Amino acid sequence: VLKLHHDTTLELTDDILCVRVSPDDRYLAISLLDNTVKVFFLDSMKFYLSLYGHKLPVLSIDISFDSKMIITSSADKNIKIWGLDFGDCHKSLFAHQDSIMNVKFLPQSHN
Amino acid sequence: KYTTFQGSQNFRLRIVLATLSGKPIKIEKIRSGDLNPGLKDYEVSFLRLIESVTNGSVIEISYTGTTVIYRPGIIVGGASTHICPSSKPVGYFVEPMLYLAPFSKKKFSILFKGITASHNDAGIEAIKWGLMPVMEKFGVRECALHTLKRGSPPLGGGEVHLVVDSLIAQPITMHEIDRPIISSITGVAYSTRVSPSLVNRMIDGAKKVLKNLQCEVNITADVWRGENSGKSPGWGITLVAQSKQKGWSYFAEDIGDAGSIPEELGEKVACQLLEEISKSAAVGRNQLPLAIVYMVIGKEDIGRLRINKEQIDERFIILLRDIKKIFNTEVFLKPVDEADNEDMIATIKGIGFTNTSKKI
Amino acid sequence: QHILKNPLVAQGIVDKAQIRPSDVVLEVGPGTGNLTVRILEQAKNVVAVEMDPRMAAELTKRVRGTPVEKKLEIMLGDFMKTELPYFDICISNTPYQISSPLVFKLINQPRPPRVSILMFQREF
Numbered sequence: 001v002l003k004l005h006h007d008t009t010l011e012l013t014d015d016i017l018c019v020r021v022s023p024d025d026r027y028l029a030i031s032l033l034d035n036t037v038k039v040f041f042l043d044s045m046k047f048y049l050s051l052y053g054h055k056l057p058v059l060s061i062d063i064s065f066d067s068k069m070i071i072t073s074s075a076d077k078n079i080k081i082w083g084l085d086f087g088d089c090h091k092s093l094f095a096h097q098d099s100i101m102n103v104k105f106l107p108q109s110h111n
Numbered sequence: 112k113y114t115t116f117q118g119s120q121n122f123r124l125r126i127v128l129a130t131l132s133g134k135p136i137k138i139e140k141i142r143s144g145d146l147n148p149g150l151k152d153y154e155v156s157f158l159r160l161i162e163s164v165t166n167g168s169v170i171e172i173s174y175t176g177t178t179v180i181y182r183p184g185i186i187v188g189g190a191s192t193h194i195c196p197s198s199k200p201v202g203y204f205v206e207p208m209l210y211l212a213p214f215s216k217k218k219f220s221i222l223f224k225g226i227t228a229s230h231n232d233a234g235i236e237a238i239k240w241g242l243m244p245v246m247e248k249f250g251v252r253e254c255a256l257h258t259l260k261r262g263s264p265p266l267g268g269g270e271v272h273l274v275v276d277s278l279i280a281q282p283i284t285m286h287e288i289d290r291p292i293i294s295s296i297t298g299v300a301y302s303t304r305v306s307p308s309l310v311n312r313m314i315d316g317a318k319k320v321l322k323n324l325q326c327e328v329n330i331t332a333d334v335w336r337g338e339n340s341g342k343s344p345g346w347g348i349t350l351v352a353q354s355k356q357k358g359w360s361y362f363a364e365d366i367g368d369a370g371s372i373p374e375e376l377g378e379k380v381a382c383q384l385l386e387e388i389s390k391s392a393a394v395g396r397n398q399l400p401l402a403i404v405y406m407v408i409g410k411e412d413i414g415r416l417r418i419n420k421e422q423i424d425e426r427f428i429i430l431l432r433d434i435k436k437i438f439n440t441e442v443f444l445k446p447v448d449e450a451d452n453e454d455m456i457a458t459i460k461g462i463g464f465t466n467t468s469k470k471i
Numbered sequence: 472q473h474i475l476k477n478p479l480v481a482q483g484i485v486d487k488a489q490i491r492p493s494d495v496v497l498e499v500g501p502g503t504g505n506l507t508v509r510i511l512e513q514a515k516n517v518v519a520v521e522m523d524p525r526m527a528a529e530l531t532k533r534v535r536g537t538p539v540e541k542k543l544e545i546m547l548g549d550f551m552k553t554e555l556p557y558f559d560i561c562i563s564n565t566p567y568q569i570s571s572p573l574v575f576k577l578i579n580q581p582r583p584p585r586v587s588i589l590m591f592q593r594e595f
Contacts, residue, residue, distance in 0.1 A: 046372060050308050085369065086344040088304050332493055 010045070020061045027067055027084065031058035037072050037082075049087045054080060059100060065107045075099035112137045112180055114436060121433060122154055123203075124400070126161055126181060127210045128437045130168075131408055131464070135182040136437075142177065149176025153199045160204060164188045164215070185468045188215035195225030201262070201271055203232035209242050210404055212275040213251045213282070216468035219275040226267030228347055228366045233397075235261070235271055236299045236349035237364045244353075244360040245398055249282035249405050251275070261335050263303050263345030263366075280466050282405040284412040287393045288447075288456055291354035293361070296321060296384070298330040298350030300377070302367075303340035309373045310334055313348050316377030324385075348377060350384045361395050363387050390421035392454050400430050407440050409461035416457045417447065438462050472523070474503060475564075481506045488560050488588045490514050497558035497584065499550050499573070500565030504530045510562065511539040518558060519543060520550045522565075555580055561587035570595060 014032035021028050021042065028040040035054035040047060056076035063070050063084060070082035079093040079100060105111075112135055116125055119141040129136040142148055150172070158170050158179070167184025195201045201223040212219055228234045233242070239256050246254050253276040262269020298317060302310045314330045321328050330350070335341070347366035353359070363383040367376060387395055394402055399422055406414040431442055440462060447454040475481060485506065490496070490513045501507045501519040507530065510517050521527045527547050534540040546553055550565065551572055561577065561584045563570075570591045577587060 048370075048372075050306060052306060052308065086304070087306055087309070088344050331491075334493075 008045075015057070017057055017059060018061045020063065022063055022067045023065055024067045027063060029061045029063060029070065029072075031061055031072065033057050035074075037061060037070070039070070039084075039087075051082060051087070060102045060104075062103050062105050064105060064110060069110055071103050071105075073100040073103040079103065112182070115139060116433075116436070119150075119154070121429060123157055123207045124430070125433060126158070127207050128404070128433060129181060130161065130165065130183040130186070130211060131214070132437050132462075133183055133185075133467075134437055135180075137178070137180045139178040141179065150179070151198065153196050153203075156194075156196045157204065157207070160193050160207075163191050163193065164208070164211070164219070164221075186211050186215045187468065188217045188219050190218070190220035190222075192222040192224065195223055197226055197265070197267060199226075200229040200232045200234075200264075201225040201227050201267075201269065202234055202238055203229070205238055205256070205271065205273055206233060206242070208273055209238075209246065209275075209401065212246070212254065212273075213249075213277060213279045214466050214468070215275075215278060216470070218278070219273055221273045223271045223273065225262065225269065226264050227262040227269035227271065227341075228345070229264060230366065234347060234349055234364050234366070236301065236347075237362055237397075240297070240299075240349065240351040240353075240360055241362045241395065241398055242401055244358060245394070245401050245405075248358055249285060249409070250279050251277045251282075253277040260339050260341065261301065261303055262341040263343045266342035268342040278466070278469055280469070281461075281464050282409040284409050284414045284461065285402070285406060286415045287357070287359075288415050288417045289357070290392050290417060290454070291357040291359035293326065293352045293388070294355045296324070296326055296328045296350065296352045298348055298380070298384075299333055300330055300346075300348040301333045301335060302346035303335045304344035305346060307334045309346060312373040313346070313377035316374040317348065317350060317381040320378050320381040321385075346373070348380050350380050352384060352388060359393060360398075361388050361391055362397075390419060392419035392422070392452075393417045394422070396422050396424075399427070403430060403434070403442075403457070403459075406457070406459040407434055407438055407461055408464045409459075411463040412461055414459050414461065417454050418457050420453045420455065472502065472526075475505060478505075481509060484562060484588050484590075485509055485513070488562055488586065490560065494559040495557060497555065497561040499561065499563045501530055502526060502564055504533045506562060506564065507543070508534065508537075508539075511542050515542065517543050518546060518556060520546045520548075520553060520555075522547075522549055551576060557582060558584050559586075560584055561589070563587070563589040567592045567595065 014034050017031040019030045026042055028042050030038045037051040037058055039049035054074055056074045058072045058074045061072050067084050070084050073079050080089055081091050082089045114136045116138045117140055141150055165184040166187040169182045171180035195204050204223055235258055243254055255274045257272040259270040259272055300310050300313045310332050345367055349364040351360050351362045363380050365380050434440055443458045444455045494514045495516045496510050496514045498507055498517055498519045501521055507519055527545050534543050
């Protein structure tokens with residue numbers, strides 16, 4: 001304060017598509033060209049997490065108001081709901097015949 | 112009801128040493144200064160385990176739950192399944208059985224069901240590569256511990272299968288007056304319900320810390336998925352240094368935390384390995400009470416064991432004050448002649464011990 | 472095409488390969504799948520390279536409906552002309568005549584296999 005400058009850059013290897021920060025300001029998720037989602041710690045960028053098995057690149061990432069569930073919708077016709085505690089999924093979900101562009105949450109509950 | 116111990120400290124140790132001796136004990140004032148005084152649930156659950164393996168043992172709990180009476184019966188054993196309560200891991204239940212494992216009337220084929228790791232108690236990998244090798248040196252040859260299903264906190268659902276077939280008359284008289292020279296460092300990294308990449312990341316951290324040491328370092332990468340992996344996700348690593356010539360193994364372990372860095376935990380346990388080795392002489396600090404007992408209940412003969420003063424803590428003395436209250440065996444400690452270190456030789460005349468129960 | 476009438480021999484070749492549970496095994500010349508079925512139980516993946524389409528069809532049939540079927544990949548055709556994937560160890564039981572080109576293909580493969588266990592002639 002109103003102008004913009006950079007603190008850091010992140011040197012990656014893939015064609016970045018969506019990046020989302022936690023509303024709890026803890027987690028920073030990143031989609032890549034690979035079937036991978038990297039969730040970073042906010043404060044020191046420690047590479048907390050990586051995800052696999054999606055076969056097509058992630059088109060939008062959500063996480064909850066309280067950082068519990070990750071949703072990484074991609075062009076592979078399905079939604080894979082990742083649990084944010086231990087980096088596993090709870091349930092994958094085939095839907096939306098063509099390819100899934102954007103997903104967003106409700107701030108009240110997991111809907 | 113003649114030997115009396117105070118306090119809930121080393122409670123599963125005191126049931127063991129009464130059982131091998133056959134001297135009845137009465138442990139009173141267990142957790143008397145609590146808002147919920149008395150035993151815990153698992154300490155009651157462990158007393159059901161001794162009943163299942165020994166016919167004739169009488170176990171009495173007062174209605175305040177702080178006084179436990181135990182007149183031991185003979186070790187029968189056989190095959191059965193024990194359910195482990197979710198407070199303490201299945202490995203914790205396994206450790207007391209190993210002390211009475213070579214002496215039963217029959218084979219121990221005991222099936223354990225529950226959570227298979229924690230912060231405090233022994234993981235499956237630690238028992239297999241730490242407790243089992245010590246048993247083999249004494250003379251317990253056909254001893255094993257199989258893994259059926261691996262669990263993890265908080266739900267677990269894992270299964271191990273303790274199978275001990277060597278039924279010997281006494282542990283042989285061990286003489287180890289030489290610090291064993293570590294040949295190789297071997298560790299097992301496991302993970303359930305989570306990414307295979309995390310296990311690879313854990314291995315990278317441990318190798319980097321141990322890169323300076325010149326020895327072959329191989330960590331088995333074990334990945335578990337599906338129903339066999341278990342109800343709750345989690346991971347852990349167990350690292351084992353070993354000496355081929357004397358068959359002596361040293362280990363350290365830990366599991367993953369709610370949000371832990373797998374680069375750090377692979378680096379941490381390898382530090383906890385080398386910290387354990389730096390305090391060690393011919394055992395570990397967590398292998399020493401298994402071997403102190405086996406010199407005592409070995410036959411009527413002097414054994415020798417080269418141990419280090421860093422192992423000797425407050426915890427080590429309470430081990431030697433539980434033996435003297437049961438077996439009345441003073442453990443003579445002599446200095447070594449090597450002036451570079453403070454090793455001492457622990458010499459024990461073993462009490463003359465047999466198998467009451469084995470048939471001829 | 473000949474078959475190994477010795478069932479207590481394949482075990483020794485598999486032992487000398489020193490399989491790890493994470494290994495990708497390249498099996499060249501799987502034949503009727505006598506070694507293949509045993510390799511599948513001990514390794515993460517078996518990439519079997521077979522020239523004969525009849526033998527490849529039988530090999531698919533042999534593992535069909537078993538719990539380890541999904542860990543078998545069958546590459547059909549001449550191994551010499553095959554671009555080989557990454558593999559940790561190799562087992563061979565292919566015809567002796569190929570053996571000569573095959574050794575130098577293995578040696579020159581980009582990232583060489585850590586270990587290989589191969590069946591050749593007594594003179595070769």
